[PDB]
Design an enzyme around this catalytic site. Structure first.
Site, mmCIF file in Angstrom:
data_model
loop_
_atom_site.group_PDB
_atom_site.id
_atom_site.type_symbol
_atom_site.label_atom_id
_atom_site.label_comp_id
_atom_site.label_asym_id
_atom_site.label_seq_id
_atom_site.Cartn_x
_atom_site.Cartn_y
_atom_site.Cartn_z
ATOM 1 C CG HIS A 65 -1.674 1.229 1.543
ATOM 2 N ND1 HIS A 65 -2.608 1.731 0.652
ATOM 3 C CD2 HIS A 65 -1.735 2.039 2.628
ATOM 4 C CE1 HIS A 65 -3.197 2.797 1.189
ATOM 5 N NE2 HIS A 65 -2.704 2.993 2.404
ATOM 6 C CG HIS A 67 -0.137 5.720 4.640
ATOM 7 N ND1 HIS A 67 -0.673 4.980 5.675
ATOM 8 C CD2 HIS A 67 -0.429 7.031 4.870
ATOM 9 C CE1 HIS A 67 -1.309 5.837 6.484
ATOM 10 N NE2 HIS A 67 -1.177 7.062 6.014
ATOM 11 C CG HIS A 110 2.545 0.311 5.091
ATOM 12 N ND1 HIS A 110 1.439 -0.490 5.233
ATOM 13 C CD2 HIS A 110 2.080 1.591 5.208
ATOM 14 C CE1 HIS A 110 0.369 0.264 5.443
ATOM 15 N NE2 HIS A 110 0.714 1.548 5.417
ATOM 16 C CG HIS A 112 -2.520 -2.706 3.799
ATOM 17 N ND1 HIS A 112 -3.463 -3.398 4.522
ATOM 18 C CD2 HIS A 112 -2.807 -1.383 3.977
ATOM 19 C CE1 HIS A 112 -4.213 -2.509 5.190
ATOM 20 N NE2 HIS A 112 -3.865 -1.265 4.864
ATOM 21 C CG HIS A 397 -7.313 2.979 19.375
ATOM 22 N ND1 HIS A 397 -6.634 1.787 19.366
ATOM 23 C CD2 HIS A 397 -8.133 2.988 20.467
ATOM 24 C CE1 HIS A 397 -7.013 1.118 20.464
ATOM 25 N NE2 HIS A 397 -7.908 1.820 21.127
ATOM 26 C CG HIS A 400 -4.845 5.466 7.235
ATOM 27 N ND1 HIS A 400 -4.667 6.658 6.558
ATOM 28 C CD2 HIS A 400 -4.564 4.494 6.351
ATOM 29 C CE1 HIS A 400 -4.296 6.392 5.313
ATOM 30 N NE2 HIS A 400 -4.207 5.074 5.166
ATOM 31 C CG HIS A 402 -6.780 2.667 2.685
ATOM 32 N ND1 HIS A 402 -6.105 1.698 1.970
ATOM 33 C CD2 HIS A 402 -6.441 2.466 3.993
ATOM 34 C CE1 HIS A 402 -5.406 0.937 2.803
ATOM 35 N NE2 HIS A 402 -5.592 1.369 4.049
ATOM 36 C CG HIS A 452 -6.998 0.188 9.001
ATOM 37 N ND1 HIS A 452 -5.721 0.310 9.516
ATOM 38 C CD2 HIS A 452 -6.848 0.300 7.653
ATOM 39 C CE1 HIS A 452 -4.847 0.540 8.537
ATOM 40 N NE2 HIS A 452 -5.506 0.520 7.372
ATOM 41 C CB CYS A 453 -6.745 1.112 14.795
ATOM 42 S SG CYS A 453 -5.410 1.692 15.866
ATOM 43 C CG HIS A 454 -1.700 2.935 10.135
ATOM 44 N ND1 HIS A 454 -0.548 2.176 10.129
ATOM 45 C CD2 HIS A 454 -1.921 3.252 8.826
ATOM 46 C CE1 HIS A 454 -0.103 2.058 8.872
ATOM 47 N NE2 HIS A 454 -0.906 2.716 8.049
ATOM 48 C CB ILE A 455 -2.007 0.212 16.613
ATOM 49 C CG1 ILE A 455 -1.688 1.618 17.206
ATOM 50 C CG2 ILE A 455 -1.337 -0.891 17.424
ATOM 51 C CD1 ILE A 455 -2.283 1.927 18.564
ATOM 52 C CG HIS A 458 -4.744 -2.087 18.179
ATOM 53 N ND1 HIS A 458 -4.840 -0.830 18.739
ATOM 54 C CD2 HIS A 458 -4.041 -2.884 19.030
ATOM 55 C CE1 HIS A 458 -4.232 -0.881 19.904
ATOM 56 N NE2 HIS A 458 -3.756 -2.103 20.113
ATOM 57 C CG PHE A 463 -9.990 -1.139 16.185
ATOM 58 C CD1 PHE A 463 -11.365 -0.982 16.354
ATOM 59 C CD2 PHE A 463 -9.176 -0.343 16.970
ATOM 60 C CE1 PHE A 463 -11.887 -0.102 17.222
ATOM 61 C CE2 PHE A 463 -9.707 0.579 17.859
ATOM 62 C CZ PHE A 463 -11.067 0.701 18.009
#
Ligand SMILES: *[C@@H]1O[C@H](CO)[C@@H](O[C@@H]2O[C@H](CO)[C@@H](O)[C@H](O)[C@H]2NC(C)=O)[C@H](O)[C@H]1NC(C)=O
Ligand SMILES: *[C@@H]1O[C@H](CO)[C@@H](O[C@@H]2O[C@H](CO)[C@@H](O)[C@H](O)[C@H]2NC(C)=O)[C@H](O)[C@H]1NC(C)=O
Ligand SMILES: [Cu+2]
Ligand SMILES: [Cu+2]
Ligand SMILES: [Cu+2]
Ligand SMILES: [Cu+2]
Ligand code: NA
Length: 499
Positions: A65, A67, A110, A112, A397, A400, A402, A452-455, A458, A463
């Site tokens: 992806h 980002h 990164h 994905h 949290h 993010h 897309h 989604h949460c970008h941790i 998670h 998430f």
């Protein structure tokens, strides 16, 4: 050197030791972080990704992806596994062929797929502006002015328990740093400046989890860009940067010639700077080659506060100046229990058929789409509001979206919304208990867009949800290349999956 906008990119396994401890990794371009991919605004990028992975302990499939790049008309090139494509299998390659109209700033790329980016597949992605409105504020802006902040783990990602509080073993600044336990005096990164010059430092969080308190002893930092969006100048002495966010700041090399600590304190893992953890070195040309002797202050008197940021351009805010003042006002119920996150009562588990392929095959409402309850349709040409009230465990949290950036109408730790001039960005901390961080955007980009949460731990624990934006126009807006149509047959054959 930078690579792109047209380039091959090989994804391999190798051993690396960025904190003195050797472990195998998943790498782009043979390094951690990967090489910088770069071009100018409006360019055609064609990144032919060669999957050369063989070690199953970090997964031999991959997907990448880009980002923060909107992918308008190229949703198939966005990269999230099982949302816009099936993974690329080992021994195969795939051309991500897209354009970047109307965007210029600091991005990253990164893996994905699952938690694979934690295992090393992360690097910077910069889209320069030949007519940058901020160009006169600095002298130097090049590969030497990019600063990456990364968490690094000794345990391989596929051995991290799902839903657990997972903690790193080192902070890496430009790929180097020291381990929190068993600390060894391994090499620290050096950022070199010339007395009197001004630098556009491009600060990129490539984190899988922690946020960092970033500062440079003796220096302050003038923010001019937030997640790709040009800002009014804001001078600060510390930046709290959450996973996947980016800032550009002007660094004025206006202190005495010498060595100064660069500090990045994560919210979990090692606290402080003993043994040179959480550190890098700012070295002026002509300084002695030795470690800095500088001190942090006990408290920072001008920290970044997100409500202080404002766009350089007159971006405004879409909709009406009150809660619910949008064509499609949403409130997500964000929760955690028993190792799994949920959104609106549903924990995300990736589908067998990517969401985009379900839509191209004729599924045309969100109740026909899998996973059931994980896809929300958005109407076309409409103002969307999304409230993201915090309280779920494991915060804060960083959410993010897309395909879009968004106005941050309400920020963490402040109950007052801003319908006039908030910053726009793509990844936002939703704050703490009782907060009501809220975002707005207009739907002018048909396709399924992950939220989604970008941790990354998670996301793996569920998430996430998918916004199926303008389902009826997705197929006409996003013609797909044969190589994309070939991905799911090849992946499902290789993994003995029937679909
Ligand atoms: C966050 O703001 C949203 C609105 O953007 C609030 O949503 C309202 O929630 C109540 C029930 O709590 C409903 O009666 C309304 O229909 C919702 N929409 C409105 C008023 O526009 C939400 O309650 C807020 N959450 C927190 C924790 O403050
Ligand atoms: C809390 O957030 C609000 C809204 O973004 C901030 O209020 C703005 O404050 C600026 C700076 O003084 C004023 O120019 C604006 O008119 C305010 N807008 C509104 C809608 O009130 C406020 O400063 C933030 N609080 C803190 C402590 O930073
Ligand atoms: Cu990302
Ligand atoms: Cu993204
Ligand atoms: Cu999270
Ligand atoms: Cu994503
Ligand atoms: Na407006």
């Amino acid at each position: 050197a930078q690579i792109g906008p047209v380039t091959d990119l090989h994804i391999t396994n190798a051993n690396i030791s960025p904190d003195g401890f050797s472990r195998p990794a998943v790498l782009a371009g043979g390094t951690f972080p990967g090489p910088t991919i770069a071009g100018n605004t409006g360019d055609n990028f064609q990144i032919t990704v060669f999957n050369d992975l063989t070690d199953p302990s970090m997964l031999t499939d991959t997907s990448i992806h880009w980002h923060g790049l909107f992918q308008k008309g190229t949703n198939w090139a966005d990269g999230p596994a099982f949302v816009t494509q099936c993974p690329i299998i080992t021994g195969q390659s795939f051309d991500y062929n897209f354009n970047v109209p109307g965007q210029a700033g600091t991005f990253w790329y990164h893996s994905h797929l699952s938690t694979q980016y934690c295992d090393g597949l992360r690097g910077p992605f910069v889209v320069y502006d030949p007519n940058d409105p901020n160009a006169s504020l600095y002298d130097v802006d090049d590969d030497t002015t990019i600063i990456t902040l990364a968490d690094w783990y000794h345990t391989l990602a596929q051995q991290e328990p799902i839903g657990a509080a997972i903690t790193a073993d080192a902070t890496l600044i430009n790929g180097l740093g020291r381990s929190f336990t068993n600390t060894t005096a391994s090499p620290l990164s050096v950022i070199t400046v010339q007395s009197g010059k001004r630098y556009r430092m491009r600060l990129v969080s490539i984190s899988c989890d922690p946020n960092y308190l970033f500062s440079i002893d003796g220096h302050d930092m003038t923010i001019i860009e937030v997640d790709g969006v040009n800002s009014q100048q804001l001078t600060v002495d510390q930046i709290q940067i959450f996973a996947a966010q980016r800032y550009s700041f002007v660094l004025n090399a206006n202190q005495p010639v010498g060595n100064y600590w660069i500090r990045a304190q994560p919210n979990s893992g090692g606290q402080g700077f003993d043994g040179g953890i959480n550190s890098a070195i700012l070295r002026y040309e002509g300084a002695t080659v030795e470690d800095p002797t500088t001190t942090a202050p006990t408290t920072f008197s001008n920290p970044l506060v997100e409500t202080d940021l404002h766009p350089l351009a007159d971006l405004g805010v879409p909709g009406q100046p009150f809660r619910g003042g949008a064509d499609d006002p949403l409130v997500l119920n964000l929760a955690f229990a028993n190792g799994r996150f949920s959104i609106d009562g549903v924990s995300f588990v990736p589908p067998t058929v990517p969401v985009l392929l379900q839509i191209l095959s004729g599924a045309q409402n969100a109740q026909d789409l899998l996973p059931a309850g994980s896809v929300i349709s958005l109407p076309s040409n409409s103002v969307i509001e999304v409230a993201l009230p915090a309280g779920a465990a494991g915060g804060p949290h960083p959410f993010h979206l897309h395909g879009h950036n968004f106005a941050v109408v309400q920020s963490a730790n402040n109950a007052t919304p801003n319908y006039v001039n908030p910053i726009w960005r793509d990844t936002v901390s939703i704050g703490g208990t009782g907060d009501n961080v809220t975002i707005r955007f207009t739907t002018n980009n048909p396709g399924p867009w992950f939220l989604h949460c970008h941790i990354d731990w998670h996301l793996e624990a569920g998430f996430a949800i998918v916004f199926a934006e303008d389902i009826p126009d997705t197929a006409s807006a996003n013609p797909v290349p044969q190589a994309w149509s070939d991905l799911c047959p090849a992946y499902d054959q290789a993994h003995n999956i029937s679909t």
